[PDB]
Amino acid sequence: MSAKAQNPMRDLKIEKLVLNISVGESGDRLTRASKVLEQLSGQTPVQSKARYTVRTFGIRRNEKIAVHVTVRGPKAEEILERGLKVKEYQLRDRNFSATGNFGFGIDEHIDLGIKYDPSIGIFGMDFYVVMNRPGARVTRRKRCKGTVGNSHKTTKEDTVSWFKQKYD
């Protein structure tokens, strides 16, 4: 038979959590909401550059409009643990993408954190959770790019099933 069974590979993993704050300097501050991100993630964020034309103020495209953190691995999991815990649940399926991705928004202030040490804050910043299968590097790694098929792509049903399994 075409092949039913149980294997971990054919499993889900946390590809990354990108915490990205889209503010816009001078309103709140230069990049100083980075201090909020810095506590929340545990790591240094990098500046987000615009290219973009907008339109409104923002006509420079070289400057720091925003700030972002890419966490992967255990670093990603520790933020997911606190991050999931605020936001109650059983949160909705609509928040989830076609991709097997979900994101939610909320203040940095939420999370176990000193409010005093962050000089400014802000709602906010999409918590974005990328989930994908192990096979994923075939598109991601340079050399031998190969697209991901529909099979190998994660589903909204799989992501919800996996995430709902733990810490929900």
Binding site: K142, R143, C144, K145, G146, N150
Partner: protein, 297 residues
Amino acid sequence: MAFQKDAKSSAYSSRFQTPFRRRREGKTDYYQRKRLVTQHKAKYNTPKYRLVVRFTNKDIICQIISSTITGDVVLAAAYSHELPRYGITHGLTNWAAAYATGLLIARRTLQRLGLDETYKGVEEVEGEYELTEAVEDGPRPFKVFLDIGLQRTTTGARVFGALKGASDGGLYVPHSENRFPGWDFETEEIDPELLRSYIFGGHVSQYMEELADDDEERFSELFKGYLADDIDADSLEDIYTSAHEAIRADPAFKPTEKKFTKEQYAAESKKYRQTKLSKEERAARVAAKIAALAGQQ
């Protein structure tokens, strides 16, 4: 779903046309390739990573390849799998394994071969240690030119260690001393230039020195014993073999080859499929197979 490509096609069809099997496969860059060949010195391909991906993390390979009309001809090759025939039990993936494979391919290129030779001036350059690259040559290096493939120029990356193995091998290769995975990085002994360090052979020594459960067969001293074996002149490989048996052979490969489709025509399976499709249409009618099948009545 998307094809997307099928509706747009012609242009979409253009996309292969530009590469061949090698870019689709994803190894080789034609501009990177270009730079070596025009010049008529051979490409010394040392893929370390990403072959298809035909190695890494278990193995490495080095071949010195030249061009010809029929296509590229490999003059000689060396595999790190063959390296334990000379004697070396430890991991094929490391620096010492890369250096020694690098000597092997150079020893196989010279071979003193062709009737033709190249015993003089100085082969053997010993397995050494080698402070900076000494050739009687001096500035001349040719008949071998480094083809990294994808693999990066990081000082301290294997790909380069094979080239240095070659240099000490009797092929004499263009190089810059600041770029090497240097002499102590194979180990051997080290270093000049702005860049520093002073162990990486020999990092496995230091890694092992830090306590943890790893592979067996001891510690630092074992690189030296087998590296010492590697120093030796002992050339001339090989094997030979069982051979094949009959005929066109394998258990997977037969349901996985055959009759329809051949190199020739899959007349039988296409015709079985047409006739089946046709009976299935006769009974239901609506959609063909592919989603449309209708007309105004």
